[PDB]
Curated annotation (Swiss-Prot), chain A:
Residues 1-156 form the Peptidase S7 domain. Acetylated by host KAT5. Acetylation modulates NS3 RNA-binding and unwinding activities and plays an important positive role for viral replication. It is found in: Host cytoplasm; Host endoplasmic reticulum membrane. The chain holds residues 1514 to 1669 of 3419 of the full protein. Displays three enzymatic activities: serine protease, NTPase and RNA helicase. NS3 serine protease, in association with NS2B, performs its autocleavage and cleaves the polyprotein at dibasic sites in the cytoplasm: C-prM, NS2A-NS2B, NS2B-NS3, NS3-NS4A, NS4A-2K and NS4B-NS5. NS3 RNA helicase binds RNA and unwinds dsRNA in the 3' to 5' direction. Leads to translation arrest when expressed ex vivo. Disrupts host centrosome organization in a CEP63-dependent manner to degrade host TBK1 and inhibits innate immune response. Inhibits the integrated stress response (ISR) in the infected cell. It is a peripheral membrane protein. This is Serine protease NS3. Forms a heterodimer with NS2B. Interacts with NS4B. Interacts with unphosphorylated RNA-directed RNA polymerase NS5; this interaction stimulates RNA-directed RNA polymerase NS5 guanylyltransferase activity. Interacts with non-structural protein 2A. Interacts with host SHFL; this interaction promotes NS3 degradation via a lysosome-dependent pathway. Interacts with host CEP63; this interaction disorganizes the centrosome and inhibits host innate immune response. The active site is at 36 (charge relay system), 60 (charge relay system), 120 (charge relay system). It comes from Zika virus.
Length: 156, 39
């Protein structure tokens, strides 16, 4: 299987044609995506197979082949880049200044960019190219646009 | 059965398209991992 670092599309042939259900990050031999993309199911990579290693429905994250490796955090001041990988379209970097989700358990960074549901799992990066979280879990505000959290896991 | 296809490198792009606002939202997170607007 292809295990080179980079961003990957999560595809399925169960529905009509081939459908992109999400996106993920390959880093240090571990595939990282959002839980609602795969529902914890096994993935295929050419001839190889990736099996789930860690997952949590509340965090909305899952890792394949090993533990969660991404641990960079948003600094709270700087602009970031959503490396959006939309269905049927080429990967493109969109720069934005994140907002804030104020919760009872603290504040989380949030990106106000609207992309198809099949873009879930696309990495959000800092100026160094480090993945500070994944896109695809948030809320819908008054005007109808999407505001996603910058969802980051924990590195053991 | 799901499968993965490489889509690119993870790199910061200088002079990328700068868009999107920065809203400060009061949200709640339930046990199913779903966010909702607290109002
Ligand atoms: C217009 C619009 O809605 N767009 C986008 C864009 C990205 C994601 C989603 C979405 O629906 N995310 C999602 C679905 C299921 C679950 C969770 C997040 C966490 N619990 C399960 N929508």
């Amino acid at each position: 299987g292809e295990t080179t670092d980079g961003v990957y599309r999560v595809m399925t042939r169960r529905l009509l044609g081939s459908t992109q259900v999400g996106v993920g990050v390959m880093q240090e031999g571990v595939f990282h995506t959002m839980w609602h993309v795969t529902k914890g199911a096994a993935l295929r990579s050419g001839e190889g197979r990736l099996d789930p290693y860690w997952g949590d429905v509340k965090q909305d994250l899952v890792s394949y082949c090993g533990p969660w490796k991404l641990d960079a955090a948003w600094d709270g001041l700087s602009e970031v880049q959503l490396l959006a990988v939309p269905p049927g379209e080429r990967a493109k970097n969109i720069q934005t200044l994140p907002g804030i989700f104020k919760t009872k358990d603290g504040d989380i960074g949030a990106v106000a960019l609207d992309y198809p549901a099949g873009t879930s799992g696309s990495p959000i990066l800092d100026k160094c190219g480090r993945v500070i979280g994944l896109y695809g879990n948030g809320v819908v505000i008054k005007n109808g646009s999407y505001v996603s959290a910058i969802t980051q896991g924990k590195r053991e | 059965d799901m499968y993965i296809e490489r889509a690119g490198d993870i790199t910061w792009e200088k002079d990328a398209e700068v868009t999107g606002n920065s809203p400060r939202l009061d949200v709640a997170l339930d046990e199913s991992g779903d966010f909702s607007l607290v109002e």
